[PDB]
Structure 1
Amino acid sequence: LTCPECKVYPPKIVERFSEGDVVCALCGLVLSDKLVDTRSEWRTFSNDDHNGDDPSRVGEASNPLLDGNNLSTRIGKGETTDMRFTKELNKAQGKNVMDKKDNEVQAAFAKITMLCDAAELPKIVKDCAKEAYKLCHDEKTLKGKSMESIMAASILIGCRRAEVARTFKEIQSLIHVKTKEFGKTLNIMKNIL
């Protein structure tokens, strides 16, 4: 936004949240009447509600950066439920699981998740290792590098950023590391911006 009335290059405009307006500090003109509490709005997607009682909790958060655009809902046993239908419907979802070579490469994330928990590594490290891997796995710069060592290299790339200290020898023992190979794969990815 910018004030029509005045218009001096740097627009000195204030958000008077409690009064619910976006105002021009210089002239006094209210530029917007509709204002939302962002923090309280975010609390309808992410909340204390696991029960499903909350009329406020109406949405669900997602990680575009990692999950991409995959919106899905579990078919599960509710209060009244004949197990027959839950099986039938889930059996049906199985036949409809004809996902791509990369929509099946999200199983490489399931590997990193199993490798981080085993390495006693934090959630942020996974979300960094799963990030660096999702960006370098398809790369020509990496080509036919030992696939087992490429994802182990992204675990060190994740650990370096999240300040969680882990030795190359530690990650080397965690999966299986061909020292020269997982040192070369950790450099092509490091070169990949």
Structure 2
Amino acid sequence: PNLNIVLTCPECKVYPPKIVERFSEGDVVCALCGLVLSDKLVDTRSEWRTFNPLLDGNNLSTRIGKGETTDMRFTKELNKAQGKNVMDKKDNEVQAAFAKITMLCDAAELPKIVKDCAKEAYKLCHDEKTLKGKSMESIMAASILIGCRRAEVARTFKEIQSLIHVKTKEFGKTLNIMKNILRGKSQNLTYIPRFCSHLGLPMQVTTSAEYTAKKCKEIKEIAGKSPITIAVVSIYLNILLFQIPITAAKVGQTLQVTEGTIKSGYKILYEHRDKLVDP
């Protein structure tokens, strides 16, 4: 069949066409020979203005509801009838899960972007004997982690682990294979301003902190083994710099780090703070 149409000026035919499209006159014209190739060009503008296609695809279902010309016996008749055919698809989990993440990201005020970004993660895998279930929650929240990270932001695991408790062991373990599945199907830098956000300080702290954060890892000090701990250590030796009292008492209740990590990380970074005088 080959089912293809490609415009070609019969008088010239010099190449794959070098032509133009006079949208206002609704035609297409040979830019050299001037012959009108095809006319009655059709608008496609006003069609979509009146108007999930990303994830489910051609699996179709139409949201419905009662009518005005309808009795109460017609109202709850439809509400009972609208659920008797939900068996035909196994997107019911998805239609609850996509609802659930929609409840999830929005409730903790995630940007609407993460809503689809997390949706992208779940629909990506949705089935693997490596998952074979897997508590049904990592596929939600680790998808958000996959979503939010893909949404170019990130939150600490506790902010999500306490948000969704999956014992954190199989949660992360099944989380990792999602990246492998991501690679098979194919980062503290954003944690900076959010941390100072809840404490309400001016804007110049972060870059000053970011300069300090950059220096620690490059020379030495893998610093954490799960180095999420030293994300705060980047910050605290900056709040130790300035005179606003936010001592580890307030950070420990806000950022939730044990002073065993805070004091140890602070002092070992007091050794190398000599090379850390920017201004």
Give the TM-score, by structure 1 length. Answer: 0.73
Partner residue in 2 for 1:117: 106
CA shift at 1:2, angstroms? 3.3
Q: 1:29 to 1:114 in 2, by over 3 A?
A: same
User: Which one has the bigger strand percentage?
Assistant: 1
Deviations 1:102-148 (A, max 9, x none): 44443221211111112211222111211211121202444453421
Q: In the aligned structure 1, how far is the partner of 2:17 from the partner of 2:120? A: 38
Runs ≥4 residues deviating over 4 A: 70-75
Q: In the aligned structure 2, how far is the partner of 1:26 from the partner of 1:185? A: 61
Q: 1:151 to 1:73 in 2, by over 3 A?
A: closer
8 Å Cα contact 1:125/1:155 also seen in 2: yes
Q: In the aligned structure 1, how far is the partner of 2:82 from the partner of 2:54? A: 25
Q: In the aligned structure 1, how far is the partner of 2:175 from the partner of 2:73? A: 49
8 Å Cα contact 1:136/1:142 also seen in 2: no
CA shift at 1:23, angstroms? 1.9
Q: In the aligned structure 2, how far is the partner of 1:114 from the partner of 1:38? A: 35
The 5 A counterparts of 1:25-64 are 25-45=31-51, 63-64=52-53
Question: Which of 1, 7, 14 is the aligned partner of 2:13?
Answer: 7
Q: 1:126 to 1:6 in 2, by over 3 A?
A: same
8 Å Cα contact 1:130/1:154 also seen in 2: yes
Unpaired stretches in structure 2, ≥5 consecutive residues? 1-6, 181-279
Give the TM-score, by structure 2 length. Answer: 0.54
Question: Which of 146, 164, 188 is the aligned partner of 2:177?
Answer: 188
Q: In the aligned structure 1, how far is the partner of 2:39 from the partner of 2:10? A: 16
Q: 1:75 to 1:178 in 2, by over 3 A?
A: closer
Deviations 1:78-121 (A, max 9, x none): 44432221222332333344334444443221211111112211
Q: Larger Cα Rg: Structure 1 or Structure 2?
A: 2
Query: Would you say 1:174 and 2:163 are equivalent positions?
Result: yes
CA shift at 1:177, angstroms? 4.5
Q: How many residues align?
A: 174
Deviations 1:145-167 (A, max 9, x none): 34212221110111122224433
Q: In the aligned structure 2, how far is the partner of 1:154 from the partner of 1:109? A: 11
CA shift at 1:179, angstroms? 3.8
CA shift at 1:74, angstroms? 4.9
Bigger RCO of structures 1 and 2 (CA < 8 A, at least 6 apart): 1
Q: In the aligned structure 1, how far is the partner of 2:156 from the partner of 2:13? A: 56
Q: 1:160 to 1:89 in 2, by over 3 A?
A: same
Further displaced range: 110-119 or 72-81: 72-81
